[PDB]
Design a protein around this nucleic acid. Structure first.
Lengths: 35, 61, 46, 102, 93, 77
RNA sequence: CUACGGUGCUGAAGCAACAAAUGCCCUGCUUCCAGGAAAAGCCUCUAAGCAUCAGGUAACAUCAAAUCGUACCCCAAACCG
RNA sequence: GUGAAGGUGUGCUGUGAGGCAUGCUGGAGGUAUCAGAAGUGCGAAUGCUGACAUAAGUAACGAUAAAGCGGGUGAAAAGCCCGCUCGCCGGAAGACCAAGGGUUCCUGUCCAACGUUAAUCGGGGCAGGGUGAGUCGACCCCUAAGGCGAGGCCGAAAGGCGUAGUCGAUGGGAAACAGGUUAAUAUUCCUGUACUUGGUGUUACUGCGAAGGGGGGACGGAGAAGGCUAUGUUGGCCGGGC
RNA sequence: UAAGGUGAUAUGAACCGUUAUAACCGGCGAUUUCCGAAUGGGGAAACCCAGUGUGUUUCGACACACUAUCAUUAACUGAAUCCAUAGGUUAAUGAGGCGAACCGGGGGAACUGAAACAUCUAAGUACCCCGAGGAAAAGAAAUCAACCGAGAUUCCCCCAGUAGCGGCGAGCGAACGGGGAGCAGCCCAGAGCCUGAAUCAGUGUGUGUGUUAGUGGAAGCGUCUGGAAAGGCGCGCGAUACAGGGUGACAGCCCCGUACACAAAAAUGCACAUGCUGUGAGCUCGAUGAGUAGGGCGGGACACGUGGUAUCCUGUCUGAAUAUGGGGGGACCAUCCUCCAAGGCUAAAUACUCCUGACUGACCGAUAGUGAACCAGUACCGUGAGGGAAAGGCGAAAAGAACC
């Protein structure tokens, strides 16, 4: 009865491997003072 | 039928091309109307109009 | 807010359309590269 | 040039009916051959409201492979192979081992 | 004045709808599926010659093909043209 | 384009070589001028973007002889 | 009417005064300087041309007006995110 | 096939990588030996792909405009339908075009998945149905910016530029309104009343005729009124109430 | 060529045929919408709008044909301007577009190496453009050699990592000569005698041979296990065929084939035989390719970076000799050897494979092998150029599970 649909991933990440991993744009961590 | 037509004149050939499409229109109306349980005359008449238009465009030249 | 893609078919077909690609040498090379790849849709057109 | 045709009383050489004799009903396309009363299966035919609404366990005959049958000679009493000769300008099926026309 | 074998190819099928039958009973309008390149003059010439009746006005529209999903793919049905042929006062077919 | 109509001198390319031998690309353009030549056969003036080497081919060979080598070649004048 | 949903037959009055736009008169009027598209449709003039021809003009009569779009969403669950 | 590889146990023995035997699965292939050739051995490379954990049945369930009841249907109703209240928006959270989308429209059906819950519901699935134009829009005629551009001028080549010309609306050119209608279309269908342009059949007096001429088209900002109207408000009238 | 068919997912439904046109396969032919070089003008490909003929017309119209630009040529008529050109028109021809690599030409990097870097390298590579062919280009000595000689180009093996070149660094890297593959030379700058005189082409019958459908093929049975035998055990037969595949497990003998022997209406490739047409022989003589060679300047190519440096090309400026003359032989000169530039054509050996046919593999076996074993350049993503997946296996046969 047309079942066992898949897990359609987002159309943003073309490497489905990291599709659910990181957004891959900007990494903002701002508190770093080393001197 | 493919052989009986090559003893016809061109005006004889053309007036049965008129009767074939009037038959083809008769059958195409019948198939949509819920009638025409014999749903094989369509393929037969469509290849009868092609059989005579072939024999038309060959004695034309 | 206002995103980068604001669609208009007229601005689409004048930029990337088949006649826009067939106007120049470097667009007929685009269409040559998209027949050589085997692309279903050649341009943005239909 | 088929060696096994429409109405031939054939004998089955292989596969649960090895030895049984029947008549071919129709040669299909893919080398499968329906033989009369030979390769019986048990079809759990589901009743649809129209179109043979008797929906029993219908026993039909399944297709057998065309290489698993041979034509029964019946003038020797055994299975027999087929060859092709030209008699009277016609391609003629004939039995092996006695060379006589079918 | 249209050639006769052209008129024999425009009228595809009479269209049944329960809107089409409302038009046949209340406004004397037969609704026909026609060929895709049918003009309103070619339909008017074909309903009069082949259905042997009289025609006032043909109104046409083009029905868009629905996108259907048979199995797992994405198909699209054909666009077809639909006439609204208004016969004058005497109705045969 | 900077082509002599008589000798066919294209611009050719080569190098600039400095005193430290740094090669960089340049072009040796031909010494082209458009000049009107009097022909007594045609009783007219005819202008030709010709090199200064081509002006020497013309008076050495003739202006009828040069133009006959252009109509039989495919140049337009 | 009749499932009273609804469809169906009926259907009286249908005036006046006042206040009114950012809308129309107005592409006006006044005024300013920063001095505010183009071409056709349209009216008009004729040239070559043209002869009670061809056109034009009016009224009257006929026919023709093709072909596509037309559902639905539009401050949005149908558009861009 | 009286059971191969593989998988899974067990036992035995080699100094080790390992080897062998076999019980069960498996249901068709496997290879003593001696040589031969290597995509020849993985735990790591913030390795690559798939699968599955963990946090954790935790956080969250997307505007604090708000819901409560009674019937209905149903296997099941907080959410669907109907009803009565209640709350919210009203220069919008309403109505309508262009763009963009492309059937999401309407009906009957289903409720797996989709819907941040349930769902009988849905912009979900499925199958039908639905878009009707001389007048609305496009097309079309006209051009603006700008594009392309015969010849042309340039340029190693590709090509750049540009004249004639030809395209290009966001502008200019032609004409329909009101009621009624469908489950879904309406200035399109139907009633009523119009109107526009072009092709085609007679009169008198007849000069008509352009890739031309001249009008006209044809145009700013602001400001100020007056004349109205849409619309509203009250009175009157009319129907009904007590 | 046939007893079966009406392509696939795909069942039907309605049928067609049965030995002579059911389908299938091939040759040839017809048809071949619309867009696209797109060519009637336009355009936002798959649409919009015509012009002029020609018909036919119920008078509403309807068909079919033509209508691009350019190049070359011809015809007509044609400015300033008298002649005359330019232009203008109308014909005929031909061209354009796409295509994977190879090929020739025009342009032309940088990263990198040098342990930095600029000369040099990478590399005349990547790329861009132009043009062509089945190959292309080169090609008939202004060549080499060394006092003997060789005898057009191309390719391969040596010579030889030599000689050299070189911030004499990194690196670059020959020839001569030798072994081979394949080996043809010819024209014009020119007039005569002779006078189709072989040639080399195209076209057409004719033959031989492939290609495009095909045809015939040779022989095994019992028996045990098993769901089923192709396996085991027993006993035969074919073999110019024991290549392979399929069949209920592993088949020479069941099937399809294979070895072999054969076949062509028709259309084509190749040779040959040629008939008929185009070029055009052989002999006598003359002729012997000038803004060239060379030079000055600046670059480039040669292994060769201007160095003592030949030779080639040429942007610029000059400028011979004309066979009793000229080039080269690695600066230059004299000898004396060798060749005759400034015109052109030219097969094979060579390079390549989009594509077709077989055939093979110490190649892969679904995370591999193509990106793609599967409706894959797809779904998806991006405005776009572009990127780009994942996803094979029931069984021998659906017998794919009636009924409760």
């Amino acid at each position: 009865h047309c079942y066992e649909c898949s897990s359609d991933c987002p159309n943003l990440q073309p490497y489905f491997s990291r599709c659910f991993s990181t957004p891959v744009w900007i990494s903002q961590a701002q508190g770093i003072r080393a001197g | 039928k493919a052989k009986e037509l090559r003893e016809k004149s061109v005006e004889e050939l053309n007036t049965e091309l008129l009767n074939l499409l009037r038959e083809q229109f008769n059958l195409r109306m019948q198939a949509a109307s819920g009638q025409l349980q014999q749903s094989h005359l369509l393929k037969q008449v469509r290849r009868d109009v092609a059989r005579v238009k072939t024999l038309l465009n060959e004695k034309a030249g | 807010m206002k995103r980068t893609f604001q669609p208009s078919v007229l601005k689409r077909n004048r930029s990337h359309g088949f006649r826009a690609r067939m106007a120049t040498k470097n667009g007929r090379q685009v269409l040559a590269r998209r027949r050589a790849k085997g692309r279903a849709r050649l341009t943005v057109s239909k | 040039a088929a060696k096994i045709r429409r109405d031939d009383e054939v004998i089955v050489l292989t596969g649960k009916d090895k030895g049984k004799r029947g008549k071919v009903k129709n040669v299909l396309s893919s080398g499968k051959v329906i033989v009369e009363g030979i390769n019986l299966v048990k079809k759990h035919q589901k009743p649809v409201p129209a179109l043979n609404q008797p929906g029993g366990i219908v026993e039909k005959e399944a297709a057998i492979q065309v290489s698993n049958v041979a034509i029964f000679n019946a003038a020797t009493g055994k299975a027999d192979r087929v060859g092709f000769r030209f008699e009277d300008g016609k391609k003629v099926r004939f039995f092996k081992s006695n060379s006589e026309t079918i | 004045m249209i050639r006769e074998e052209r008129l024999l190819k425009v009228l595809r099928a009479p269209h049944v709808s329960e809107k089409a039958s409302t038009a046949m009973e209340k406004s004397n309008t037969i609704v026909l599926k026609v060929a895709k390149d049918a003009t309103k003059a070619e339909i008017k010439a074909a309903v009069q010659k082949l259905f042997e009746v009289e025609v006032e006005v043909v109104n046409t529209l083009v029905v868009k093909g629905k996108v259907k999903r048979h199995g797992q793919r994405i198909g699209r049905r054909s666009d077809w043209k639909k006439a609204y042929v208004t016969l004058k006062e005497g109705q045969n077919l | 384009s900077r082509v002599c109509q008589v000798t066919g001198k294209r611009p050719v390319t080569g190098n600039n070589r400095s005193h430290a031998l740094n090669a960089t690309k340049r072009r040796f353009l031909p010494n082209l001028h458009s000049h009107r030549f009097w022909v007594e056969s045609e009783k007219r003036f005819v202008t030709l973007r010709v090199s200064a080497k081509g002006m020497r081919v013309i008076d050495k060979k003739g202006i009828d002889t040069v133009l006959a080598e252009l109509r039989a070649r495919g140049e337009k004048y």
